[PDB]
């Protein structure tokens, strides 16, 4: 009961540390130069340092990974905060990607074995709700702290990191088949091809349609996060029914494409534009679904499965936004059809199960 509560704070810190850099970066984007290609490289640092290093966590996972990774996060983020020049920030984001791609398999694996055979409800619902809570509260916390001594937010998430060591070392205690991996590992990429390509561009699709000042869209998406959290807390009923393992993903994808289709024809900012935020609920029942699926293929050694998630979901989350930004200009509605396309691709790939279930 307390090990798991200590454990969530690591993941909360990782994604709050991704979210805390947004309201401080423009302060020294002008103090270092940092042209467009340099900023794209700074983004890709975290991507290709999370990519290959994450399966290695599952290579090593069979306690120790979480604590070394969290020291790595704190050191990484301090050295980001030092901020000499690009030669420092680039390697800082690389080692930070190392840390956040080593702790994420460590947590995503070790929850899957300490928790009892009801491992879905509290455990994975809150592990994929605290992720969104960190993404929300990143800029929200960073707003107050960036006003005073703009370096302060950074090592703030630095200082907490050291705290997140001690709780995770004294309040907690310790106690093959590449073919079967194929079904979700490609699957989790496909949605991450477009879902990311959706989310990244939601602040540009609904500023060229009905006008959204930055506060209104923030209200829309905070509401989406809250009313998606309040649905993935009672997630255990919905997964205990709906033919647990794999069927649920298909129904969520059909729901999402339906509400996207309804979204393409929505004017009227407050009535039928704001309220259609509920689309993201259909995209927030699937991340716990694939994480549980990964934890359920591998009987032991859940670290490998969590790592194989956290590498290719980051591959999708990196490939997608570039494509969506590139082909956004040829339309205004281009991001939506990417999400529709990948959702129907997901529907196609999940219904392959019946032929696969017909043989072993």
């Amino acid at each position, epitope marked *: 009961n307390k090990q798991i509560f200590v454990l969530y704070f690591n993941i909360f810190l990782i994604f709050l540390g991704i*979210g805390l850099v*947004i309201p401080v*970066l*423009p302060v020294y*984007l*002008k*103090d270092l*130069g940092l*042209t*467009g*290609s*340099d*900023l794209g490289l700074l*983004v890709a640092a975290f991507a290709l340092s999370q990519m290959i290093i994450s399966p290695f966590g599952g290579t090593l996972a069979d306690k120790l990974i979480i604590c070394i990774g969290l020291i790595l996060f704190s050191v990484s983020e301090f050295m980001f905060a030092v901020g000499h020049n690009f030669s420092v920030l680039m390697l800082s984001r690389v080692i930070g990607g190392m840390s956040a791609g080593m702790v994420m398999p460590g947590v995503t694996g070790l929850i899957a074995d300490i928790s009892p055979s009801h491992q879905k409800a509290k455990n994975f619902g809150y592990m994929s709700a605290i992720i969104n809570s960190g*993404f929300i509260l990143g*800029p929200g916390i960073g707003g107050f702290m960036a006003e005073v001594s703009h370096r302060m937010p950074f090592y703030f998430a630095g200082a907490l990191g050291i705290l997140a060591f001690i709780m995770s070392i004294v309040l907690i205690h310790d106690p093959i088949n590449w073919k079967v991996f194929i079904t979700p590992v490609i699957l989790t990429l496909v949605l991450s091809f477009g879902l990311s390509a*959706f*989310e*990244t*561009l*939601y*602040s*540009l699709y609904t*500023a*060229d349609k009905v*006008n959204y000042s*930055p506060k209104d*869209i*923030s209200i829309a*998406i905070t509401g989406g996060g809250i009313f998606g959290a309040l649905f993935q807390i009672y997630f255990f009923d919905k997964f205990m029914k709906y033919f647990s393992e794999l069927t649920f993903i298909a129904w969520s994808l059909l729901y999402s494409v339906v509400v996207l289709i309804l979204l393409v024809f929505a004017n009227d900012y407050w009535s039928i534009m704001l309220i259609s935020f509920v689309v*993201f609920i259909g995209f927030d029942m699937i991340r716990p679904a694939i994480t549980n699926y990964f934890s359920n293929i591998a009987g032991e050694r859940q670290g490998f499965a969590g790592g194989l998630n956290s590498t290719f979901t980051s591959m999708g989350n990196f490939i997608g*936004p570039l494509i969506a*930004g590139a082909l956004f*200009d040829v339309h205004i509605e281009a991001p939506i059809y990417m999400a529709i396309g990948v959702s129907l691709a997901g529907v196609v790939i999940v219904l392959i199960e019946k032929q696969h279930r017909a043989k072993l």
Partner: antibody, heavy 132, light 107 residues
């Protein structure tokens, strides 16, 4: 705000129509390897008008339609500068050619509103005078 | 492509509100900037991508997208805000400036 990027230009002066100037916008203080260079101009009295451009790496020399074909713009990353040819001069080309640099992007953050940035840097300009 | 900009002379006393509007010939994007040029110096950039203040710029220079009617709004003019204001369209690699708006003091 701690910035010292200075763009300088040199090479104006009196000409004859059909002459050949070649205007050096000697960049400084930045990684020329990945940036844009834009050449604007201002006739005496009127308002600004864009006449050439170049992307230093992985780009093509975009031009203005009214004065396309009489200029050959090229950027030499070796000596940290960028030049612009000057051929078949007409009386409509007396001007004050600034050398400018612009970028603009978006740093997105997961279905919130993240960023915008401009980076802005301009020059000083050389009076180019035409038919005498 | 053109970028019609109106009006071409403002005689506004110190501390009052002014509004300058550009009308793109085609709806391009949220990509418009709003330079200003002091007499005989270089243009500086004030607002980029149609809404975002530049660093080191007073908070009065509040821009506003409106359909294709990109606008710049100064709440109050001050003795350092009396110079020509240009608006630039950053289209697909065919840049075009505006016809030019002047701002002049009242006696």
């Amino acid at each position: 705000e701690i910035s010292e990027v200075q763009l300088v230009e040199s090479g104006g002066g009196l000409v004859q129509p059909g002459g050949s100037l070649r205007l050096s916008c000697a960049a400084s203080g930045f990684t020329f390897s990945s940036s844009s260079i834009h050449w604007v101009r201002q006739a005496p009295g009127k308002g600004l008008e864009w006449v050439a451009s170049i992307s230093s790496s992985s780009g093509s020399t975009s031009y203005a339609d009214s004065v396309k074909g009489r200029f050959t713009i090229s950027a030499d990353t070796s000596k940290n500068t960028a030049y612009l040819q000057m051929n078949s001069l007409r009386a409509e080309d007396t001007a004050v050619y600034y050398c400018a640099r612009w970028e603009t992007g978006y740093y997105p953050y997961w279905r919130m509103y993240g960023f915008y940035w401009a980076l802005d840097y301009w020059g000083q300009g050389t009076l180019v005078t035409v038919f005498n | 492509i053109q970028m019609t900009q109106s009006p071409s002379s403002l005689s506004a006393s110190v501390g009052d509100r002014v509004t300058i509007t550009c009308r793109a010939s085609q709806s391009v994007s949220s990509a418009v900037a709003w330079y200003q040029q002091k007499p005989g110096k270089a243009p500086k950039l004030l607002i980029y991508s149609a809404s975002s203040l530049y660093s080191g710029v007073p908070s009065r220079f509040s821009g506003s997208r409106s359909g294709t009617d990109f606008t710049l709004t100064i709440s109050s003019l001050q003795p350092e805000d009396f110079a020509t204001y240009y608006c630039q369209q950053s289209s697909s690699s065919l840049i075009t400036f505006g016809q030019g708006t002047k701002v002049e003091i009242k006696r």
